[PDB]
């Protein structure tokens, strides 16, 4: 029984806390997880307690080992997550631990003051356990705890995992699995239909009726956590309020989500999904070409002397490019030119911020039940995925007030005071709330398509 997966956003290392592949494809694994409806539960540890507001005290289960043997014990997490922490921004940000120690299964993590959201980024991908003993290069070929261990790797282009018959919750039901990039949504489907491919990711919507037809073939889609965006770069001193607000105007988000996304996406305000209960949106923007025009003049653009915007884009998500060339034929019609460029890394592009205006983008806004991540990470100055540099000290002042918020209630009301505040920055344009649609062979069974838009194969995944 071997699987065959295509995925898109290949990536360079895929060392844990570089990349969430290795959770999704089932190599490794974090302390804890969301279970199918996105709580929050505990995976490794058997237990925890949190005896005062700066100290959690975790017992690990007893019976877990790493795919080379070695058992999991609390100096192995400990120095796992210590190295994380050490080699990663985004790690080290989403966790602000002041010492961890460490006996048997028993590890203490200390902060300095009260981080409420300290247990849920431990369920955080990048935040998987690996062993740093293990004599490999762990930017290749990390051992995990998961049911598959990754056995090779061509970086960039494809990933060779083998069953780690040990495996703690089951045995797992695959022989082999082989994991391969293809940034092209049109691709992976061909590939899907020919069979070189048994599941993918990514499904351009255009698509989805092709693979309901085939009954070869079938289609799971989930409503989840991405959202669609437009993002500036906020270093580039031309992109102004007034030119992010005049992009944010020639946007036409009703008509993307009933046409691009084919009804598959609902229209986007702030960066998290209307469909949380507690989230306030901002109002609704509609397409307002005259608005736009009238915005722009007050930066001196004219047909004459139009705004001229490189907008970078990527196949990855299929419907982004799709969106890129609607906003450059609308764009004419307010006086701004866009030059899109497509690239096929993504993030090594936009590394350099000399490089770019604006790109089209996709956040998983809300992976774990909270905002705060999505804050510290993409709104606060070297934020790990603030590739624009948004940064607004009003802001960050809400921000930094909310990590140390216990009572939910008081979490959600300063939340919805940041997406207000916030909103009036346009620090990017969020487009879409858009489902996550995966496409498999009818043989293939038990992977997961659940909203945080993170989970695929476990030890329960299989061909029948
Ligand atoms: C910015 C980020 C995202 O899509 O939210 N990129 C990576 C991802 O898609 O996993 C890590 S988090
Ligand atoms: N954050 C973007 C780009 C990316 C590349 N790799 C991971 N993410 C996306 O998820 O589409
Ligand atoms: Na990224
Ligand atoms: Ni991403």
């Given at each position: ?11 360079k290392?895929?060392a844990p ?8 494809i089932?190599?490794?694994?974090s302390?804890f997880?969301?279970?199918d409806?996105?709580k929050?539960e505990?995976?490794?540890?058997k ?8 100290t ?9 080992k790493?795919q080379?043997?070695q058992k999991?014990t609390?100096e192995?997490v400990?120095?796992?997550?210590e ?5 990663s921004?985004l790690?080290?940000?989403?966790l602000?631990?002041?010492s961890?120690t ?5 590890l ?9 959201e ?11 356990i ?12 990390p051992?995990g705890t998961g049911p598959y ?5 061509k ?11 040990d495996?703690?919750?089951?045995k797992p039901?695959?022989?082999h699995?082989?994991?391969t990039y293809?940034?092209?949504?049109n ?6 239909e020919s ?10 919507v255009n698509k ?9 073939l ?6 989840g ?11 580039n001193k031309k992109?102004?309020?007034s030119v992010?607000?005049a992009?944010?105007?020639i946007i036409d ?13 609902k229209p986007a305000t ?7 209960p507690?989230i ?12 736009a ?15 001229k915007i490189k907008?970078?884009t990527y196949?990855?998500?299929?419907e982004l ?12 019609k307010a ?6 460029k497509?690239?096929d890394?993504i ?7 000399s490089?770019?205006?604006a790109?089209?983008y996709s956040f ?15 709104y606060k ?11 607004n000290?009003?802001?960050?002042d809400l921000?930094?007030?909310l990590?140390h918020t ?5 979490r959600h ?6 997406i207000?505040?916030?909103s ?5 344009s969020?487009?879409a709330y858009?489902?996550?649609i ?21 030890y329960?995944?299989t061909?029948?």
């Amino acid at each position: 029984k071997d699987l065959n997966i295509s995925l898109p956003l290949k990536t360079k290392s895929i060392a844990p806390y570089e990349t969430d592949v290795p959770v999704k494809i089932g190599a490794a694994e974090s302390l804890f997880k969301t279970n199918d409806q996105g709580k929050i539960e505990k995976a490794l540890v058997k237990s925890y307690h949190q005896p005062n507001d700066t100290t959690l005290d975790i017992e690990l289960k007893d019976n877990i080992k790493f795919q080379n043997g070695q058992k999991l014990t609390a100096e192995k997490v400990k120095s796992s997550l210590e190295n994380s922490m050490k080699k990663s921004d985004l790690v080290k940000y989403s966790l602000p631990i002041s010492s961890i120690t460490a006996k048997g299964q028993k590890l203490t993590i200390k902060t300095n003051s009260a981080y409420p959201e300290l247990v849920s980024e431990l369920a955080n991908p990048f935040m998987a356990i690996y062993d740093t003993d293990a004599k490999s290069d762990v930017n290749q070929t990390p051992v995990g705890t998961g049911p598959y261990q990754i056995k090779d790797y061509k970086q960039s282009r494809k990933i060779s995992l083998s069953n780690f018959k040990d495996y703690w919750q089951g045995k797992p039901k695959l022989d082999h699995i082989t994991v391969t990039y293809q940034e092209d949504g049109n691709n992976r489907v061909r590939n899907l239909e020919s069979q070189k491919d048994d599941l993918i990711t990514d499904v351009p919507v255009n698509k989805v009726q092709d693979i309901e037809n085939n009954q070869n073939l079938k289609v799971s889609k989930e409503s989840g956590f991405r959202t669609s965006l437009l993002m500036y770069n906020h270093t580039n001193k031309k992109m102004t309020k007034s030119v992010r607000e005049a992009l944010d105007h020639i946007i036409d988000r009703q008509g993307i989500a009933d046409h691009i996304y084919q009804g598959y996406a609902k229209p986007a305000t702030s960066p998290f999904n209307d469909k949380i209960p507690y989230i306030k949106e901002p109002k609704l923007t509609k397409q307002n070409i005259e608005q736009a025009k009238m915005l722009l003049a007050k930066d001196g653009y004219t047909k004459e002397h139009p705004l001229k915007i490189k907008l970078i884009t990527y196949d990855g998500r299929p419907e982004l490019s799709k969106i890129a060339q609607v906003l450059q034929s609308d764009a004419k019609k307010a006086n701004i030119e866009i030059d899109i460029k497509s690239v096929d890394d993504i993030e090594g592009y936009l590394k350099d911020r000399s490089a770019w205006d604006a790109t089209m983008y996709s956040f998983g806004t809300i992976p774990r039940g909270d905002t705060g991540y999505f804050f510290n990470q993409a709104y606060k100055k070297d934020g790990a995925i603030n590739k624009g540099d948004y940064n607004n000290s009003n802001v960050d002042d809400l921000i930094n007030q909310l990590n140390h918020t216990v009572d939910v209630k008081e979490r959600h009301n300063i939340s919805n005071d940041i997406i207000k505040l916030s909103s009036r920055d346009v620090p990017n344009s969020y487009i879409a709330y858009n489902d996550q649609i995966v496409a498999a062979n009818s043989k293939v069974k038990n992977y997961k398509v659940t909203p945080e838009g993170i989970y695929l194969i476990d030890y329960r995944t299989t061909i029948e």
